[PDB]
Structures are given as structure tokens and as C-alpha cells.
Amino acid sequence: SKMDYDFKVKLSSERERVEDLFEYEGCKVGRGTYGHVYKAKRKDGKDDKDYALKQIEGTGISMSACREIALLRELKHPNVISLQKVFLSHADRKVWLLFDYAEHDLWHIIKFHRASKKPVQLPRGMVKSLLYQILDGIHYLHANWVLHRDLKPANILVMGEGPERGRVKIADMGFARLTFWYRAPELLLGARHYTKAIDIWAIGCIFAELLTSEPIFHCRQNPYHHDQLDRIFNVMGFPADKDWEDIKKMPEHSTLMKDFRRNTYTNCSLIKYMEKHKVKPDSKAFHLLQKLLTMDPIKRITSEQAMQDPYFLEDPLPTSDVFAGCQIPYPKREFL
């Protein structure tokens, strides 16, 4: 028949079961369709390091799961999440992914900086370092022709106590998928291919949020989302023909022409917005962000160039640990 028995039992007396190799109570999250994620510890005393155990919701091996496993399996960069192993239960065909465990992320870190009262500004040094590690990670990916396609604070993880204290780790917790607050304008005007540039736009959105602690393009609740475009224009201003010459080439340009009258955003600009949130227009930080936040995608600078910015040469300088040497006040993850 199909498989020899001796070969099955040998594999069934040597293989590792996640249930016997890890102590996993600490259910960090449960999710309609993504299964369960636990905060896990090796049952051997070999290492005290924390891990995340993800059980995928479906049985078998999804295609989304295939491409994720195959990608993470090749990526080695300190600023992109690490897949440490995969466990396959042949009985109940379930799949387990083990990652090095990140105690924090930018969504929770930013949220805590508004739960304490009016917002408290984030430490400038932390913001520089956060952006720098995000630019290192996306660059690495982009240089391997890997597009993230969903960059947003909840996807930026931060390592907690341990040997990678305060190091950004870029992830994609809704990779099976593929708020429009981080979506580049061309996507809203009907673009049909994802780009390196779209990622850079989302990096700038994150950057503005770190500086102002608010989501720059935040908006109430088709490829085309009129109300989200109206927030971009309200912040950025409406683009001139010189600013985005090929905007005419967009699939939704006719809808944009029918739904908007550029005269509405006469007093609107990034300078004007960033001024209200105490970011000064002559700073090195504002100029860079303006370079990230450019309407025309091919006028948007690349991740490698942004790392080369004088902003990171100004004072203070980026640290491997975004938390400098100070105490981490953000709460740890709760169990369910």
C-alpha cells in the first residue's frame, strides 16, 4: 500500500510533540480563524527564554500557511520576526508555529501613551530608534523582493526583557488576509499591484503617529474609500498636477474628479498639520517624514535612503534597544 509500517512507527517513536516539549499556559490571544497563541516555555531547563506557540485554526496545511512557513523559513534579520520551528501533529492534522516571544508592540505602546490622564509625548530617542529598526527590517525584506502589504503599529513588535531588549521585530499576524489609516493613496485610487512604495507610505504613517501619538490619517468607518481620501487631503492638502503627474492614470481618477473639488484643501498641508502637534517644520524629523509621506509613489524615497537620513546622524542617536537603558512601563500581555 501507500506507506511502510516500520517507517511510520519509527517516525512515531522519534518525532516531537509540542504537548510534551513545551509548558504552554499563557493564552496570549484567541482568534476566529487564526487559532490560539500561547506564551510558552521549554520544559527542559535548557533556556529560560519565552516563546509564542501558535496553533493554526484549520486542519491541514493552508496555502497561506505554506507561504508563511516558507518565507519565515528563509528570513534572517534581527528586525524581522523569527520562526524557530514548526510542529505537525499527524493524528489531528494541526500545525504549530513557534516564534521568539515579543512582550510588546507599537499599538499597545502608543495606546498606553494616551491612557494616562491628553497625550504624553514619546521619548524622542525611542521614536528615532523605533523608526530606524523599522527601516532596517523593511529594507531587508524589500531587498529580498518581499513586500509586507499591511504595515501598521499592531504589526511592529518590541522585544521585552531578555537578550534582545527593546528590539523591533516586524511581523504579519494577518498574513492569511492578503481601518485604511496606513493605506497609500494609490491603493485608494484603485491600484492593482502592491509596491515597495506602498510600504514606505505606511512607515511614514507610523512615523507621524510616533511623533504626535495620534494616527495622522485616522477616519471613521470597493477599492475606493472616499472618506479616507478626504482625511489624507485634509492633512496633506490636495495634490497638484506637478506633485503627482500620473495620478490621471489611476483607475479611480474619474471618481476622484467627480467626488472632490481641490479648492476645499487650500489651507491644508503637512506643515500646517505637524505644526499643531508641536513638531517644528525646520526639524530633521519633519523633513524625512515629508519624504516618506509623498503623494506620488515614485517621488517617495526608499527604505535604504531613509536610513541614510541626517535625522539619524543628529542627536540623540539610535540605539539597538529602543528603551535606552530605562524601565519598561508598558504592561505585559494578559492571558485568557
Binding site: 500500500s1 517516525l11 496555502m63 518565507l71 528563509e74
Partner: protein, 265 residues
């Protein structure tokens, strides 16, 4: 396009460029039932079953290449009796299509392609009728990921070869034959022993010899251990000598009975 230029850091290079001595050592296990020449013919034959399979599903060559490598990897470590190669081959194709981003093959489509291709193009080897259902494919899929340690990104000579013929500057006169000779290296263990850039260079070299072009200038300009690529050349010429003396349709069935089979409880 993902991880296209990471091969020197890939798991492919870091865990699947095996040493010929270990390959031959683990291969001793099947050699009790089979001869060396018959074994080659067997793995030549399942390359052809995989080619045929992917042709019927209209899968692009590199999807079919990755599936062929998957197959060669598995049986480089485990015996021919461990899993029935007739089950393994469609499973490889099935895993490649998902992994290779091409798209899940319809469950109905995978079994139908299996069924039809043995019936149509391989009736001399199998009179039985394809016997496995989607249940077995999914079970075998798990054994496949386990064995490969989930290394699923595979590099092939096609990409380096395009760069070579393009940058050498007569792309249209050399590439069709050189591409075919790359196709033909999958009749061998080359993809397990050498990086695809070396394989691709040795395939370019033979195509020039066939078309009588002299590219010695160009090759000596390259900084590549020629003594290594010349080994590959000998394999590829051994490949063509083998092809002449192999009558798969008249030999394969008795070789298929010879080959060891899975044992029940």
C-alpha cells in the same frame, strides 16, 4: 521573486547541498534489491512522471522543478519503500503549487491529473489504475514537510542562466538549447550536489559546444572554479549516453517490480 538573491544564505544552500558520499551511503539501502543502473532509471522515470503531471496541470516549469527537487530530497534520505513514489510524486506537485505561490491545485484536479497521466502516458508501467485519494495526499504531505524540515524555497538554474546568456550577449541563439539541457539535468542528482549557478554554467557550456560557438574568452573571464563546473559537464554527457541506452517503456515495468515496496502491519 521572493528571496531571489539570498541563495548563499538560504536553507537550500545551508541544508540541502549534500555530499555525494552521504547520498551514496544512504542509497546503499535500496541497492540490495536494485542495481545502480536500475535506480537511476527509476529516478529518471519519476522525473518524467512529475514532468508529465505538471504538464497536464499547466504548471510553470519552476513549479515542476521545485516538485522534482522535493522528490529527490525525500528519497535522498529515505528508501523507495518508505512511501510509494506514485503517491509521493503528485504530493510533491501539490506542495510545490501551494508553496510556489502558483495556487492550490483543485482537489478534484490533482487526483484527476494523477489518474489520467498514468492511464494515458504511463500505461506500460501501471496497468492497475491510480489508487490514491485526496486522503492519502494530505497524509503524505505531512511526511514531506517533516522530512524537508520545512525548507520549501528552492533555487534553480533557470534564473542564473538567463543572466548569463543575456550578459554574454547572444541570448536568442543559445538559450533554447541551454534551457532544454537544464531541464535534462533533473534526470540526475545535480540539483542536490551543486548550486544552480554552477549547473547553469555547465549547461551553457554544453549548448555552445553543440552549436559550435567558442566562448572560451567569456568563460575564462569569469571567476569560477572551472574544475568544479567541469565535473557537471561530465555528468550531463553521462546523462546523454544513458538516454541512448535506456528504453523506459520496455524496461520500466520489470524494474518497478524489482523496487522494494511498503510492508503492511
Amino acid at each position: 521573486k521572493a528571496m531571489a538573491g539570498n541563495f548563499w544564505q538560504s536553507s537550500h544552500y545551508l541544508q540541502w547541498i549534500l555530499d555525494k558520499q552521504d547520498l551514496l551511503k544512504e542509497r546503499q539501502k535500496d541497492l540490495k534489491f536494485l542495481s545502480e543502473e536500475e535506480y537511476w532509471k527509476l529516478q529518471i522515470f519519476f522525473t518524467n512522471v512529475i514532468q508529465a503531471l505538471g504538464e497536464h496541470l499547466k504548471l510553470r516549469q519552476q513549479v515542476i522543478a521545485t516538485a522534482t527537487v522535493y522528490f529527490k530530497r525525500f528519497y535522498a534520505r529515505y528508501s523507495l519503500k518508505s512511501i510509494d513514489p506514485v503517491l509521493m510524486a503528485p504530493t510533491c506537485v501539490f506542495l510545490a503549487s501551494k508553496v510556489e505561490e502558483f495556487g492550490v491545485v483543485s482537489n478534484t484536479r490533482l487526483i484527476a491529473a494523477a489518474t489520467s497521466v498514468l492511464k494515458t502516458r504511463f500505461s506500460y508501467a501501471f496497468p492497475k489504475e491510480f489508487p490514491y485519494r485526496m486522503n492519502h495526499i494530505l497524509e503524505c504531505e505531512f511526511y514531506l514537510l517533516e522530512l524537508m524540515d520545512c525548507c520549501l524555497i528552492v533555487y534553480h538554474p533557470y534564473r542564473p542562466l538567463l543572466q548569463y546568456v543575456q550578459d554574454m550577449g547572444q541570448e536568442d541563439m543559445l538559450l533554447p538549447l541551454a534551457w532544454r539541457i537544464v531541464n535534462d539535468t533533473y534526470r540526475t542528482d545535480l540539483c542536490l550536489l551543486y548550486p544552480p549557478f554552477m549547473i547553469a554554467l555547465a549547461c551553457l557550456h554544453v549548448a555552445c559546444v553543440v552549436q559550435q560557438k567558442d566562448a572560451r574568452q567569456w568563460f575564462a573571464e569569469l571567476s569560477v572554479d572551472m574544475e568544479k563546473i567541469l565535473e557537471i559537464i561530465r555528468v550531463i554527457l553521462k546523462l546523454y549516453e544513458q538516454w541512448k541506452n535506456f528504453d523506459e517503456r520496455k524496461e520500466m515495468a520489470t524494474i518497478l517490480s524489482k523496487m522494494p515496496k511498503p510492508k503492511p502491519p
